[PDB]
């Protein structure tokens, strides 16, 4: 009956361009229980009216988590033209969304640190002539089109990955470039929160 946040507290978290997503329906949550397990640094939210995020019922609660350094904390705002908001992670502009940046504490050992931070600095699709470039901008609450061709971790800074598409899909190529940002001493991650609404069920209320 209680929403299970356990997949976040185990193993290694993914990168920003291949984030892991957890959807919560028909359960009760305790956001203070979660944020107490991480040193919370910076965070932001947008939109209310019901109004809350830890004191309201919704039809669903979406939570994306990924390893992200606080060095590029400014690249997460929607008003930024950085590759993160352009090719990696864009959250919903219409629905009420939140965005939390925290660090994995030293007393939280179940989460093992990845080798380094990784993100997509450019994801574009080239046509049959191999000259026309089409930037594949990421949509809100979607993955990059180049996720199918990029490793779960960028191996070296300045790497290029390309794969020829099938003639049924249109032919051409899909090319993406990777960038690496060296790891910190404590794992820094970013959490993306979005809430939906429906007429049928509202079984996503806070635990009281």
């Amino acid at each position: 009956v209680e929403c299970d946040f356990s997949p976040l507290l185990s193993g290694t978290p993914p990168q920003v361009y291949n984030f892991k997503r957890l959807v919560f329906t028909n359960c009760n949550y305790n956001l203070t229980k979660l944020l107490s397990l991480f040193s919370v640094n910076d965070f932001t939210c947008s939109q209310i009216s019901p109004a809350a995020i830890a004191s309201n019922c919704y039809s669903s609660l979406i939570l994306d988590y990924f390893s992200y350094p606080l060095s590029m904390k400014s690249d997460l705002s929607v008003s930024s033209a950085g590759p993160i908001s352009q090719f990696n992670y864009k959250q919903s502009f219409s629905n009420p969304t939140c965005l939390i940046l925290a660090t994995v504490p030293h007393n939280l050992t179940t989460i093992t640190k990845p080798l380094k931070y990784s993100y997509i600095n450019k994801c574009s699709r080239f046509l049959s002539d191999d000259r026309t470039e089409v930037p594949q901008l990421v949509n809100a609450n979607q993955y990059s089109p180049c996720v199918s061709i990029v490793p779960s971790t960028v191996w070296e800074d300045g790497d290029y990955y390309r794969k020829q598409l099938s003639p049924l899909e249109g032919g051409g190529w899909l090319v993406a470039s990777g960038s690496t940002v060296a790891m910190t001493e404590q794992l820094q991650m970013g959490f993306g929160i979005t809430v939906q609404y429906g007429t049928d069920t509202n079984s996503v209320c806070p635990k009281l």
Partner: antibody
Amino acid sequence: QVQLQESGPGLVKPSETLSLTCAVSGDSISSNYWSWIRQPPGKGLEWIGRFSGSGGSTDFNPSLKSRVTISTDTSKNQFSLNLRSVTAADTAVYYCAKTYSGTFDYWGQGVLVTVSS
Amino acid sequence: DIQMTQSPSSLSASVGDRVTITCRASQDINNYLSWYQQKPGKAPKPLIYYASSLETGVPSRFSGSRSGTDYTLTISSLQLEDFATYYCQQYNNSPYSFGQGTKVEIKR
């Protein structure tokens, strides 16, 4: 159009060291990534290690990392595999292949290496 | 490491049947899974990359899917060309583990 061809002795004496060279035709090794994969006769696949002719540093399997090394050649458009202290369990069909994220787009005709005195 | 449990190890089916081959990972691989077809005495042939994306020039009978942490390769209509050994591979983290393989053999 990118092709591959393995070139090996086929028989390696037990105590000594085996060298396996992979020839890539129709593409440059100074881009993308490449790797080696072996398969013992009658069992599954074992991934040796990935490397890069573009970067290019490597990443190997810890089960064979202490006995595996790799050389790279740009002009000859090839790369070799060096496995020392081979045992009777190292009898396998070795494949070299291309990659971009860990999968394998193109494989080469595997070469057999048998170790026995 | 992350290790793969592919099942069934072998199955007997005939032409026209629908056969599903599953593959479970010890940890979450985040859809970074690939399928291969291996004919006897030949190199593995890539069929599916990123769990569900079909390779170029591969028939539409082959499809990829994911439910929970189980990855399934389903051949809608089996045919004579498809009787071989199939493998699943993960490339989420090193070292890259391989499936034991599933041998699809014609049934008498």
